Amino acid sequence: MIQEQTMLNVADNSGARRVMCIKVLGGSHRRYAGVGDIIKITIKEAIPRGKVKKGDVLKAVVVRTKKGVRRPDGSVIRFDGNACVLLNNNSEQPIGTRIFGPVTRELRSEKFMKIISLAPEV
């Protein structure tokens, strides 16, 4: 789950829906990414009204996971497939000003601060 050469979903605003995983990165011999991991992406498909180009390369942060996410002392939540939020190449943070879906409250790290500048559930 969230391996190289296998497809991913988008949670960033007005630029792509369907994208390709090309690097798992973040250290040494790492695998099977959780929410808050950064992944290297190519835009497998775009649409002409959006802000992005097909075949262009960038990073994204994981926000929806087929392996789910842990936080409370005795309950685990999981979803269908895997989705990520697209990042700016050299200044970091999410590209858009809004995010699709309920996503995660477990992710708050300072590289992705825009996620607490929003309210996806409540």
Partner 1 sequence: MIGLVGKKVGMTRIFTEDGVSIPVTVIEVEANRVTQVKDLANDGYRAIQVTTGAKKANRVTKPEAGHFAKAGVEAGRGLWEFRLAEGEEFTVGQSISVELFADVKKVDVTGTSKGKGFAGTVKRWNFRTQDATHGNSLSHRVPGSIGQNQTPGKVFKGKKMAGQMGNERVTVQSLDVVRVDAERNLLLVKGAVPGATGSDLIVKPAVKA
Partner 2 sequence: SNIIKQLEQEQMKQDVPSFRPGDTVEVKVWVVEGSKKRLQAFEGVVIAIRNRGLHSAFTVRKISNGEGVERVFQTHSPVVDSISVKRRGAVRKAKLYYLRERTGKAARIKERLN
Partner RNA sequence: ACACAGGUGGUCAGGUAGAGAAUACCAAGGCGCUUGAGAGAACUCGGGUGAAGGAACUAGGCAAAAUGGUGCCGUAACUUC
Partner RNA sequence: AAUUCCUUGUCGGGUAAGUUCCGACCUGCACGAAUGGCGUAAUGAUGGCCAGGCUGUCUCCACCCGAGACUCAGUGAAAU
Partner RNA sequence: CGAUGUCGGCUCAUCACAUCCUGGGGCUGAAGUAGGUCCCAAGGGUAUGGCUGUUCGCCAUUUAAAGUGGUACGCGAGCUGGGUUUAGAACGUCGUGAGACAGUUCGGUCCCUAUCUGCCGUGGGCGCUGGAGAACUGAGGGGGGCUGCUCCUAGUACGAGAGGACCGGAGUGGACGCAUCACUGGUGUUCGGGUUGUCAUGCCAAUGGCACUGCCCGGUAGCUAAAUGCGGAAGAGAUAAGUGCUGAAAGCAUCUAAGCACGAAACUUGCCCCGAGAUGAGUUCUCCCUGACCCUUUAAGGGUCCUGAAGGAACGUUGAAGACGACGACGUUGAUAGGCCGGGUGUGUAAGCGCAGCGAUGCGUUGAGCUAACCGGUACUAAUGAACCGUGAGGCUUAACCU
CB 60 within 8 A of CB 81: no
Which residues 12-71 are close enough to bind partner 1 by CB under 8 A? 71
Q: Give me the torsion for CA of 36, 90, 116, 83, rounded to 10°.
A: -40
Stretch touching RNA by CB under 7 A, among 8-16, 25-33, 99-107, 112-120: 25-33
Question: CA distances (Å), 92 to each of 18, 61, 86, in order?
Answer: 21, 10, 9
Q: Residue 103 and residue 70: Cα distance in Å, rounded?
A: 13
Work out how close the CB of 88 gets to partner 1 at its nearest, in angstroms, rounded to a whole number: 33
Does 100 sit near partner 2 (CB under 8 A)?
A: no
Stretch touching partner 2 by CB under 8 A, among 31-39, 67-75, 83-91, 107-115: 67-75
Which residues 44-83 are close enough to bind RNA by CB under 7 A? 66-67, 70, 74, 76, 81
Exactly one of 27, 72, 89, 119 binds partner 1 (CB under 8 A); that residue is 72
Q: Which of the 8 DSSP states describes residue 71?
A: -
CB 106 within 8 A of CB 23: no
Contacts with RNA, residue ranges (CB under 7 A): 1, 3, 5-7, 23, 25-30, 32, 40, 66-67, 70, 74, 76, 81, 110-111
